Design a binder for this molecule. Sequence first.
Ligand SMILES: [Zn+2]
Lengths: 194, 131, 170, 111, 154
Amino acid sequence: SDEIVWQIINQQFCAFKLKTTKGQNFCRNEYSVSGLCNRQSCPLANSRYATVRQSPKGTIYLYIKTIERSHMPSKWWEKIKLSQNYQKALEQIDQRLQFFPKFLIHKCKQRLTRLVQVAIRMRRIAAEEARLGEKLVPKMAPKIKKREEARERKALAAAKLERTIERELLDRLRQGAYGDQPLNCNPQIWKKVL
Amino acid sequence: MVAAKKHVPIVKKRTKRFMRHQSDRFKCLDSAWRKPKGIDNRVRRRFKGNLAMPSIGYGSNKKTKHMMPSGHKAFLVHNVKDVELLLMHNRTYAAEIAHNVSSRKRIDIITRAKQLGVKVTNAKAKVTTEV
Amino acid sequence: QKWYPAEDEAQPKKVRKAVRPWTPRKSLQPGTVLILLAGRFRGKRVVLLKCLDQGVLLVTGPFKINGVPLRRVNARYVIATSVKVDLTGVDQAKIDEVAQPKYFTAASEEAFFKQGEKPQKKPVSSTRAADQKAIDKALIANIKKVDMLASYLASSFSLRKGDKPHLMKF
Amino acid sequence: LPDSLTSQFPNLFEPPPVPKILVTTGINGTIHKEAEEIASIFPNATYIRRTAHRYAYKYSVREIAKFAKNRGYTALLVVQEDQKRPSRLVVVHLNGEGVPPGPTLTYTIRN
Amino acid sequence: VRYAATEIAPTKSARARGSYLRVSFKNTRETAQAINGWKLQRALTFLQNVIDKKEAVPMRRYAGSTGRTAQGKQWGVSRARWPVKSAQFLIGLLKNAEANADAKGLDTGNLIIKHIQVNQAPKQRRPYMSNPCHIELILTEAEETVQKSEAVVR
RNA sequence: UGAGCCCGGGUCGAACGGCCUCUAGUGCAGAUCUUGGUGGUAGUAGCAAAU
RNA sequence: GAGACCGAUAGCGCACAAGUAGAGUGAUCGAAAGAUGAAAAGCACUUUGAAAAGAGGGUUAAAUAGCACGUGAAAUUGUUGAAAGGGAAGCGCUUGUGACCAGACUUGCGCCCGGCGGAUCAUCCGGUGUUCUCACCGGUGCACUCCGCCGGGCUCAGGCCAG
Ligand SMILES: [Zn+2]
């Protein structure tokens, strides 16, 4: 009944389906070896299936599903640890997925390659952000932005900037902060002050 | 080397939009295209010097349809799980964060997409750099 | 190589486009006086030493006569005249040496502090200057031996009124 | 019941020397005229861009602070942009002699 | 990027407003356009010399052929009229802005009319419709000029 | 191709969207179309009923 | 008591003063009109003046939420800035000029030494869950193997446009 569940999934409804307007559908299922909704990549409509997933520890595993455990949703997948050596992991995928469809083997090798490349890229990126020290933070929220705009308007109104500058300059002129014979003002102006 | 895929050159047969006839004169007429249905309408009869109508001959190449000038196709993302779906399609698709995604979720999406090697079109959204 | 192909990236098919030697014009002979049509030495008369490959020509307008250093130029940007100067005495070994396609080629505190500053115009060389003198020595001697030619190579070519290049005899 | 200020910041609080100011921008900064004007505010201030071209080395603020400390600069100013307009001001006091680079004050430029 | 021309300091300007005023919009707009850009005392004398009959107000956009006298020679407009009530309302708003500038601390001898805007108010529902208006004028100080000092050598 | 759709910037303040099906009071340029609002005529004709 | 109903030009004419205001001699006819804010905290006080009006100042998260009050479209209007024109304007195709805006490949991998640290390495030991042969912990050490990290060295691959 692989074909019947495929017809039900593909032509009626699937909860793992992302329909895009750009010419491709995507599979939201975590065990999909390629995140695409097509006949060969369906983890549900294929009784024998294989995928490659990476644990939060960083260890990458190969997951194999057979027809004889298909009525056992808690026992669907057997998990096999893949080696850190890339070539040895490729040969492990070749050995465990012997006599499988060539599509599943090919996509498993591609997914393992992409996961190792993403791990290397992640290490390089983490080193670069550790060296630079930059970090993205959110901007001000609209309520906080409106608050700062209104209170800055009120503070600018209450500042009286030019009057304050003129008053402080005249105050500095009175108390002799510029010294005798000030270079700032005319001699008649300094005469009037005294 | 990280870019889009090798693709055939992007050719747009027409860059302008098809405006509705007499929509520049009346404010009650939107510029969205409406096919003229009058018998003596010279736009419908295709007289010289008039508006062209949209035809299937104006269609884009199937190898470069829906493709941005960078070569990627836009993929709308609402959360981190959505950018994870582009693990195997980092060279064919670019992430477009949805307009109603908050700032912290945007930071989560941008960080993960950089690690996955997926371009983000609107990465200059409501975020800023702290030293 | 190291990685399995992680995406269905099609390899290119084998192109049947081989590389065959460029066949120059019959007027591009060694020693022919050439009129440059483009560049910063535009309009200056030089002497072709050796025809290189893919359209490139090794030319040198004796620096003493006209200020054109040992340089390369595309053949589609030169006009070949009927005057051919004798190259007897000019060392062909030196010409072959300069004719190799690598002669005209080339994060810290100072790297940061040099950002935004104008690059310095480099002085030339002590061996390239000697190379120019080595070729020019015999070339200038032959050009002086030729009647009236030294004043010809020092004058820049230009078009006057009424002169039609289609009816000329360059 | 200042004393806590001069205990916490003895370099800022025996007269300080003449200031030499280095003004820079973000990583791929586009505010060159704005940062040049902000440098022209302060006496003895030079503006140096941070990346030269698009695909060059990305120097960090700590590296630039050490570089300017080794060249006798007194303080480092970083002008960070948002929508091609100045948004943040980062003032780092490089100090001198054996004192490490001092306190960093981060302000927001709004209007 | 391009930066817009920033507003003058609020310590150097004085604003007056009048809303839902029961005067005709067209006559008030023409009167406001006549006095736009002038000095304050000149506008005071013109509005007081148009309240009592000496001086004319020209009309350019909302121009009706009513009077053709020599008083329009100085404006170059052959159509000139004398609205009265708009002059009183503009006078009241001008002394309001003068009081605002005196309270704020501005020199009232160097005040010029930076901008004066007449907008339409909601129409009075009584088919005869009244045309009230809003008036928003902003006076500023004359721009002050400071002589430079010669640059020093280094 | 198109009807349209997605994102950025501003404003705003409590709900909303995609997909598979179901359903309909489901798509406007016109009907001397209905209701509301607003114009040129026009500060014109005139000081007339109302105001 | 409910609904695959309507949501203020809809749904009863009437969500609110509704068979009310108002019209007609009368029988009868019959509207328009909802939303501040969480809370009136509904703007004290100083100062113009006769206003259903302002300027400071204050409350509030916010007053460009001020009982003209959630948001605030278009028609239409005013101020400022730029450009063009005076025997129609408007439209299609194609360059140019000015102003403004955006910012191109998201720009990488592999080898060879030296040091360090972990392991899927050790036919090392103990434990847990299992699809019973696969996973996961804890402790040992670096003879081999494999991963990373740091300091040097080298090669290669790289987007677009011209000749
Ligand atoms: Zn599917």
